[PDB]
Symmetry: D2
Subunit: 399 residues, 4 copies
């Protein structure tokens, strides 16, 4: 039988990653409140998550990685996000960066993983840095904001534009060691506080050529790492869909948790003004139902999309323009549905739910943040899909 | 690769029912306009559909039926509804009634199908009839409204309440021959006109006991026909989810067609007042995108739900309270999503689209009708699900 | 003097107001509604009744026997009227508001129309689809001019066309032509507002002399031939278009207010077909009735406020600045969209019976949606117009 | 000319209260950030607001009060809420309580205002207290949560149920001096932080009969203070619509501020990923337009409702069942519209807007809180109005 309201535990003889997550979930849940005040992921959480081996989800097998399918991974992040969104958000990023790093040169991957098999990277991908072309690579300078999980990473993946005979942008990623940049703690946010999305400061950072890859090359199987793992079901695929798969995952985790949290707290609810046992009133029942349907629909779309990713990777098939536009955008629609489902419950949660001692308030804030990421912006995504559906050339104004 | 915007054609040797539908679809599409003025399904349409054998979708194999899975069937209805909603709606009903008839006695099924293998039933299920208990069965009297496809059926499935010693209702279905009732043509509607949902008039109609089955018995595998087909993947299951699977299917077909129809007509769209070509303006693009996502999400939910039905039928497993509530209600949420997707396009279609010579106007009206059926009413469904999710007893006020 | 949230407040001017006069004839209009829909135009009886109370002279100058009604008072008459028959109200509103434009043309044209026949009106077709040849003394116009609501009952038509510049910039212009100059082609087969008789006008080598041509911009800015004619008027010193197009939203509000009443009437006794439970007062239905009531009351409040703003401007002979003009242009479109939401919310809970030809709900639903299909009520366009103005951007010539 | 986007400044000789608010508004705006960390209204804010005399809005003239009309008052609160919602919310309550106090006995009013003309009350109205009937009054015990502005008030209006020969509830209000209760600082909320809605602790508090009034009596012009001020345009009216007029007022102020704040911050907005200057893109323009229309409509409804209040008060006319239901509920619809308007802008504000250093984030949170008050709950209000519109008896489960 299928499950509409959450992830189905894969019945494979042994313990699946999802079951392993499920066991440590209560611990993650209890750190949530102190995680929020810490403004970064508690060490205990990283320890637990690394212990079960989730960070090796998309690490090549040759280094001791698992090469988990996208669906299985995403479902781990969804479940995790229910306990602490920020932990799930940051840890998802640390995980999915490994998938990108697998498309860089064998030389870089050896450098990261032979040395330390448990090493991970955080990122700052918006190309704000100033790049001087020196020989053997580049010198990069700039303030690189929003690096989720940066405190727990050994490296950072940093985005920049190089240029051209013609002066056209070459969007590129460099991988730099923790020693090359300062973490500037300016992370004071109103949602997903525990993600520790601090800024990375780069001062005359040299990046050699072998630690630089073109974004387009990693979208199209033309990067230095292409072909390294010919038995892999996950590396013959564009980097970005995996890169950014976690946001919507987190959004779904939060929304599914919201429905549970709301149900728990509603049962016993009494009207301040009249003194009525009011938890099972029709309006509240109908809200619970609709939000349940809305996120179930969101889940079905995501599950279908993830399946589409999986099938493509299996066949080493790169997506065509149309499926790529769907992969790029479906997650944003999912995020928008989830936020609707959360808001519908929050609107009926009452004043008590806005107190610091109510989990609902945290879920609400975290849910909204998931739709604030540049990748989950639906105005942008509606335009990207719309243009593709009408056979128009892409608008370079957005990506 | 997966398809977000429509049904995936099943990869089989020879040709699948969906491919057979796809071949005759242009013919069905061209009759659509005269079908709407006919206020019933054109003979040609029934002929074509019976020729490919779709009416034998849920007929037992022993009578030459196909015993199609629910997903495969539902997808045929979706595709069909794109060409002529009314035809798909009525024909879906004729089909799914066979699934119920398979749960009646072997004696009744032999009576219907050994005589005529291509025989079907229309229905009128709301228990408005007055029932006198005679011996050997009942005498039924009353006006039985809304019998979609009644003109093309050899029988009718008719709903009525019998009474229990105490005085509680026994909701029952009787199967009566075309000769026992008069079709009263009062079908003048504003949507799904081609379904020919005329009224059936019953005057002192005797129904013998073997042609009567309890609704609850056919929900729970306790009817006279239970066990007849021990190799069947579709008969060991409640009757009602199949019975009413077509409405949402039709709703999805319409909405997917709406997106295509709107896209076609938008390209060349010119502003009356200013004279600009305006078909690719951002607002329209974003609408096309959003409605595409909305119905894709609607499809994903339906596909998942249909899969759930299929798996249950395979294992001869009757659903528990929870899954049953989801099966009962997911379709209603799907219908609601589709209508939103249609409305979003219609709101931007302009006055032209409201002319009799525009298909959009037909799709809009037909779409809205799909949410007007008592089974797709979402207020009712929100309550049914909500109550179940909170572990409340069902409200007998609705079903 | 308590306020009314759910409909128009009847003005207590001593004696009888136009709204009361509408209210008296409303049951008659309501009963013709069904045959009006099959007629695909306004029944003669309806025009007769409405002209008898004198509503068509709402915006006719007083010198010709006109009333010069304020915009609020007029709009409210159309709202009330739309409850009984949307198509009648839609078409008749247009016949009325055209007189307001005609008052900005030359004294010569107005004399020509109204001294001859004081009860004469114009229908219109304003989208500039015609081909114009500049002859001397005027123009020769050719083309098929679609969608002329109430064209069967009009003595004239107001017809839109582009003339051209030294540099070939468009000069959007309106010509007023007599019924004898054009053929009404009956291609009006629509799925909403059927009774408006929005047939097409066919123009074959129609000569329009200069004095029967006015620039749109001139009538927006108080620079047309008729400017200054009526110095005591509280309604003619104002842009033509806001009055021109005031009726669409009015009709949309009338429909939505009627929908709430119609739904309430039909809901009380509603039984579940399946269970036989007396279900008219169930919480979901009650909450829908409430929300749609609030939504259209909000829509009304916006419209009433906007109409008041129009009235005050006209009183002071003050032309609106860019900002208020953008609000006047667009508020009605938001009102229309709210009303359609309010209707849809009720229709979604109305059940299958409400989609039968013998149910008024179905007519209200269709007519409601049509009101949001007019090029002037398109909200995507309006959102852009307002948005651009709010951010201090130049207007987008792609829309208007 | 009318104003759609804010309050019209009344043209009078001298300076209107709204102009006086407008002059001090920049000061209130600058304290907003430290007000939020203070978790109560800064002394400077109370000082400024009391200096202009706003607290005397609804104080009877005989004590030096202004007896402002509801519209004029409400508009001051709307404007004020734009600078600091919590300040406006708490100060509105201090103001509107005076209006209730005007319906108590002359004896109580003399006691409060002859002594201190600038004295105000905060409140806690939900009847959670345990009441012992002693002679001469009652002894009240209990924890009385959520008293906005309690730190700045000289008194508290406290709600409780007494009983009746037949055991019916008699909902009553008592006015108690600051010395009779302890302010327990448990106010740690996620919105409207600066309102200082701490809890009042009542231990064996004696309330004499003359400081107790029946709620129903103050709804119906039957309380001890009725008739005291026969020239008053505001006191011959139910207490509650004034009592609770400020919530929606605050909600509107926040939403109008949001539009301005969003406009300011959008102009210069660049896409992180593409470097495009993107502040004037169509989707953002359309959002600004729609949110502008939505709150304008919300304003129009409120202004109309306030007008209706004013007219009634002038004529000393108590509202009938129907208008009362509208007065009770319109404000809840207004709040719901405003929250939609804010959410639509927040959804397009991007990640930067969720940082602690962005005002948008404060406006969002504050907006949502305004719809969390028991009085602004729309599910409750939809039910109240719906029942009245259908001529049903009120549901005692809600009020
Ligand atoms: C920001 C905020 C401030 C409030 N201030 C007061 C107050 O000053 N006096 C009062 O009686 N209630 C106040 N209320 C509480 C409400 O009156 C009501 O008791 C509360 O919303 C209980 O509803 P709930 O617990 O179901 O959410 C306030 C509520 C919130 C949202
Ligand atoms: C019910 C209906 C009646 C109309 N009546 C008129 C009319 O009388 N005169 C006119 O110029 N336009 C009329 N219009 C047409 C619009 O002005 C406009 O030209 C039309 O909406 C073109 O928009 P479209 O192409 O997008 O649909 C009417 C439109 C509809 C919805
Ligand atoms: C287009 C249309 C076709 C229908 N066809 C049938 C039918 O074939 N058999 C049946 O029992 N009910 C049919 N129904 C009626 C419903 O089962 C149900 O009795 C009806 O929706 C009553 O709900 P209402 O009167 O409250 O709207 C149909 C309804 C509509 C919308
Ligand atoms: C909670 C949160 C965490 C983020 N973490 C990262 C990150 O780890 N790496 C990164 O490149 N961008 C991260 N982003 C920033 C986005 O990629 C993007 O640069 C940002 O949304 C800029 O959009 P805006 O300023 O227009 O809102 C994060 C954004 C948010 C909402
Ligand atoms: O690739 C993107 O545009 C979204 C993204 C941003 C940061 C990140 O770490 C992964 C994906
Ligand atoms: O079973 C139901 O309640 C819905 C339904 C109605 C008619 C029909 O033919 C099939 C299903
Ligand atoms: O002026 C407009 O653009 C709208 C309009 C169209 C036809 C009409 O008769 C009046 C106004
Ligand atoms: O009267 C109410 O029910 C709402 C309200 C609550 C507290 C308050 O201070 C004023 C009004």
């Amino acid at each position: 039988r299928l499950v509409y309201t959450h992830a189905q535990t894969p019945d494979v003889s042994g313990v699946s990653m999802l079951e392993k997550i499920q066991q440590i979930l209560p611990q993650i849940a209890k750190n949530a409140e102190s995680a929020e005040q810490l403004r970064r992921v508690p060490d205990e959480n990283i320890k637990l998550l690394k212990e079960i081996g989730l960070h090796r989800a998309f690490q090549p097998k040759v280094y001791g990685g698992l090469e988990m399918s996208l669906p299985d991974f995403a479902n781990c992040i969804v479940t995790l996000a229910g306990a602490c969104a920020g932990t799930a958000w940051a840890f998802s990023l640390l995980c999915t960066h490994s998938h990108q790093i697998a498309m860089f040169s064998k030389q870089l991957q050896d450098e990261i993983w032979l040395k330390d098999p448990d090493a991970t990277a955080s990122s700052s991908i918006a190309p704000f840095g100033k790049v001087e072309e020196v020989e053997g690579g580049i010198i990069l300078n700039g303030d690189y904001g929003w690096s989720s999980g940066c405190d727990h990473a050994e490296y950072a993946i940093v985005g920049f534009n190089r240029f051209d005979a013609d002066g056209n942008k070459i969007y590129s990623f460099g991988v730099i060691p923790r020693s090359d940049y300062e973490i500037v703690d300016n992370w004071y946010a109103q949602a997903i506080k525990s993600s520790g999305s601090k800024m990375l400061k780069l001062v005359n950072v040299f990046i050699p050529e072998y630690r630089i890859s073109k974004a387009k090359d990693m979208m199209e199987g033309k990067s230095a790492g292409f072909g390294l793992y010919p038995d892999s079901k996950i590396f013959y695929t564009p980097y970005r869909p995996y890169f950014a798969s976690g946001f919507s995952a987190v959004s779904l985790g939060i929304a599914e948790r919201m429905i549970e949290a709301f149900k728990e707290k509603q049962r016993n609810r009494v009207r301040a003004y009249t003194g009525a046992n009011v938890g099972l009133a029709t309006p509240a029942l109908m809200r619970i139902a609709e939000s349940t349907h809305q996120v179930a629909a969101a889940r079905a779309l995501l599950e279908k999309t993830w399946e589409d990713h999986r099938i493509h990777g299996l066949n080493h098939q790169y997506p065509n323009k149309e499926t790529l536009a769907f992969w790029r955008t479906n997650q944003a629609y999912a995020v928008k549905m989830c936020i609707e489902a959360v808001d519908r419950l929050m609107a009926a949660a009452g004043a008590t739910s806005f107190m610091d001692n109510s989990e609902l308030q945290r879920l609400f804030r975290d849910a909204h943040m998931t739709g604030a990421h540049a990748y989950t912006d639906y105005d942008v995504c509606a335009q990207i899909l719309g243009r593709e559906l009408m056979g128009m050339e892409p608008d370079p104004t957005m990506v």
